[PDB]
Symmetry: D2
Subunit: 244 residues, 4 copies
Amino acid sequence: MAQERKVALVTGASRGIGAAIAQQLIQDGYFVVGTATSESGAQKLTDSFGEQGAGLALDVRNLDEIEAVVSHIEQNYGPVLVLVNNAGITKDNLLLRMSEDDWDDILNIHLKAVYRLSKRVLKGMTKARFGRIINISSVVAHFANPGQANYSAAKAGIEAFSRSLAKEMGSRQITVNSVAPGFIATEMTDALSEDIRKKMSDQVALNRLGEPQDIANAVSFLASDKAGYITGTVLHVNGGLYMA
Amino acid sequence: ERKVALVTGASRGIGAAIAQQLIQDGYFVVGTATSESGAQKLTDSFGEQGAGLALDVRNLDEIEAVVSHIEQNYGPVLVLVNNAGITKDNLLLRMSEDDWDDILNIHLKAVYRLSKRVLKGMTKARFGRIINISSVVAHFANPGQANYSAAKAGIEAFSRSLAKEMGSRQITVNSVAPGFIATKKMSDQVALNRLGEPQDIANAVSFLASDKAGYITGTVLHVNGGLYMA
Amino acid sequence: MAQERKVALVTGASRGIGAAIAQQLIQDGYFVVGTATSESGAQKLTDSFGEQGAGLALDVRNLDEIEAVVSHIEQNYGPVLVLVNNAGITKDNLLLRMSEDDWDDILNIHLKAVYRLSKRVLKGMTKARFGRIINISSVVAHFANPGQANYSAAKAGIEAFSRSLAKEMGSRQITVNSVAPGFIATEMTDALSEDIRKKMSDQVALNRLGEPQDIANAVSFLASDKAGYITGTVLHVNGGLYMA
Amino acid sequence: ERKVALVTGASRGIGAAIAQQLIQDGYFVVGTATSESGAQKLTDSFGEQGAGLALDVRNLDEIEAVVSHIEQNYGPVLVLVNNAGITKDNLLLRMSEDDWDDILNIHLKAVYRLSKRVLKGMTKARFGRIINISSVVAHFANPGQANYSAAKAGIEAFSRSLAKEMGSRQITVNSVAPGFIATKKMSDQVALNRLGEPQDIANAVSFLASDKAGYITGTVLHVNGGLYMA
Ligand SMILES: NC(=O)c1ccc[n+]([C@@H]2O[C@H](COP(=O)([O-])OP(=O)(O)OC[C@H]3O[C@@H](n4cnc5c(N)ncnc54)[C@H](OP(=O)(O)O)[C@@H]3O)[C@@H](O)[C@H]2O)c1
Ligand SMILES: NC(=O)c1ccc[n+]([C@@H]2O[C@H](COP(=O)([O-])OP(=O)(O)OC[C@H]3O[C@@H](n4cnc5c(N)ncnc54)[C@H](OP(=O)(O)O)[C@@H]3O)[C@@H](O)[C@H]2O)c1
Ligand SMILES: NC(=O)c1ccc[n+]([C@@H]2O[C@H](COP(=O)([O-])OP(=O)(O)OC[C@H]3O[C@@H](n4cnc5c(N)ncnc54)[C@H](OP(=O)(O)O)[C@@H]3O)[C@@H](O)[C@H]2O)c1
Ligand SMILES: NC(=O)c1ccc[n+]([C@@H]2O[C@H](COP(=O)([O-])OP(=O)(O)OC[C@H]3O[C@@H](n4cnc5c(N)ncnc54)[C@H](OP(=O)(O)O)[C@@H]3O)[C@@H](O)[C@H]2O)c1
């Protein structure tokens, strides 16, 4: 029997936020394809999802890989009808020490990848007259952070891209939205001290760090029928760290 | 039994959809109408999972009597949805003091009054949801609606201040800003090329009132089909 | 000889920001009417402005006073063509201790006064096909501050009011804008300790408290021909305390 | 002598108005064009109060040569106005990699590159103005402009980050977002019921580059006639 569930593609699904998003979309009833940067990582995803998802190796910096991955999904599982752009890294530096590579690599991994993957999935969504593109942004696209001019520019760019695309695709009942996490407990915050986590949580109105599941819950909502009249927005999930 | 939600203006439209959805979600819903007859209709619709009460949100005495009644009979209000409203549009040159004041009182003052009155129960519970219905026109301005736009924008700023005050007690305070909701030129302005339905707003309120939105506070959730985008 | 300069009305011009705005608009060439809450305060303003302005007593809570003041200006100096809504106070309290009076008095002094004064001056601006309404808002209408739910609601309301009015009056070449100060050195910050002023200035990107003249400079710009294509905006003057 | 301003794309339109205004304000203005012929025309327009240089902001080598030349011959760049730009609009389905990349490079990458290159002189002076020309469409979205809107929104966020980095040295970093500027259906969307002129933008840049805006940093100054309001 053929794969019959709607297909979601979640980039960077190995851990933390990406992993929680992938698992929640599986629980919601999607067939989930998740990506990792290595075959070994991809195989781990495959095993975690069991027979309701697949893991694929992908470096989102490369158009040929993006095209190959989506073609593979279309040929084996179905058209990508939910796209979650989550994969990313940071290369922080004050501008006076921010190299051409530091800049280009971050813009390519974040903003260029959103452009490339969004463009590649539009045809299938158009034919379906259904689609969800959900981009993971950051509180830092709103609240200024020194040392992250590259990351902030990319994430803000993604939000503006999302608005333009939402206008273009709305008549096909495709929604395009962003989710902007605040302080979410991840590998990186785990590496910080208890004292610094307390300083962080004191700035959050809710007085605690969030969890990957909080971001998964937002993505889940946006990907659902409960959010069909929401498009071109940023859904802030930061515990009142930043309010708009 | 269940946690109690209070939904103001639950007789029809958006409020009715919200009240019915929160019932389906598992809340005991107290819905309000401006008449005793409207309040009875709600009691009859909700049956065992809710109650109807008459309330004019312009009046502090009624607000205090209504919440007291709920506390005596059903339990503390742990989800407050401030939805009751009207419009009295006019270009500023034709906008009377009464038209200004009545809109500010029904929308913004009521949010201040009801929010203040429910804080103690939420604080004791270390749980709460205050969900205020705003509007797209608090962002995308419309001539003739200076009173309504001022009130809804006020509500949003109120909500941010209160979110900061109450967050440590795990009370979230948020706004939902509907676009054009059906109660051709309009739907052409919307990216999705259709008007919204009350259920679209109920769905957003339902999300916010749930554990799925436990880390969301002080925000505006825009439900407008791409009529206005941030 | 009759009063020939364009007339500006600046509410609460006794000190700090209001005083600096009034004096700058005089330097710009306006005839400035400033207000104070007492006759004694009004007389001080009269003397400070010399023969290029007037002081009038006004409590902006009262419609009859607002109407009387503007009528007086029209009968003696000219139509109000620049309106600067600056007068105000705070009555801070956490919501559980914020009384009906605390709420009503702040909404009336800030938002109702803007509505009342704006409405009262429109006819003269309409006839002139020139007008500037400039409302003094606050960073707190944007950046959440506990204890100021009344003040934040009023200032945010003023900004939304300004947008609606800007749409209504734009075809008459009347602009309606707000200026949102951050940490400005005033009587109130003078009353704080050196330590607390240092904590404040550490949060400002420019690493210092602003001065009343910084707000006057913004108001001056908006009231000028250099800002004739700017309407319905908030001009933030906070040294990068809050960025949008 | 005077403080040096660099204005990219000063040949015509908004950039030309900015360059002429900054001259009137008292800056020595270095303006740029994409050709040697265009650069000569600027040198001739500016006379004693400015110079023209050829620059394609897509190229890092040219950016570095241009600023070095200015530093050798005129003084450190203390006011940088990033204005040079083009559009390559298309619906996303027809937007090629080249059309994406070229817009990102000319707009956003150039702002990164030029800002980085001028920091040292501004830091030494403990004075600086970086003024980036954005656009209303970074806020009020337009179909067909996903590349341009992404770049301009990126520029604004870049500007906020840099404003935080450089503020202690009294360097301000701000964006000016023009609406429809003339270079009927359009002017009906504008509250002021007319298109803007290049001078409206020059006036806003002039304000920001002056001591009258010494406490303004990390902001967007909207100059759009009420086409889009915050
Ligand atoms: N954590 C937070 O608090 C926070 C706050 C704001 C925004 N965000 C955003 O939320 C998203 C999740 O971030 P995170 O902190 O959870 O990340 P993370 O735990 O570090 O995970 C990174 C993921 O992205 C993948 N990845 C890295 N480089 C890649 C490339 N070139 N191509 C394809 N995939 C690549 C990684 O693959 P491998 O595992 O195979 O290396 C991994 O799955 C990001 O977009 C981030 O910017 C997070
Ligand atoms: N519809 C839209 O497109 C739209 C867009 C943006 C925002 N909103 C907001 O959504 C909310 C609901 O709007 P709607 O379109 O559903 O309105 P609606 O269909 O006219 O319903 C109004 C409700 O409020 C109640 N109400 C009116 N005045 C009241 C008072 N003084 N005290 C107590 N209750 C009162 C009414 O009670 P009775 O039935 O007893 O009269 C009714 O239940 C409002 O806050 C509105 O501003 C709506
Ligand atoms: N200072 C800051 O850092 C800051 C920050 C954000 C926003 N703001 C805003 O900027 C404006 C200036 O504030 P400020 O702190 O400079 O004020 P301030 O120095 O305390 O001056 C208050 C002024 O308003 C007048 N006033 C008070 N109550 C009045 C009433 N009922 N009717 C008429 N006039 C009245 C006072 O008159 P008398 O002198 O006769 O009493 C005085 O001239 C205000 O709107 C404020 O909300 C200031
Ligand atoms: N016009 C509007 O309504 C509007 C609205 C929003 C934003 N803006 C922004 O305002 C800025 C100026 O726009 P405009 O309307 O004045 O444009 P314009 O009249 O077409 O002028 C463009 C300028 O940029 C230069 N330029 C183009 N490509 C370049 C490159 N690769 N390297 C260096 N310089 C280059 C041109 O030089 P040559 O003369 O040598 O070709 C010219 O001086 C742009 O950033 C634009 O995005 C304009």
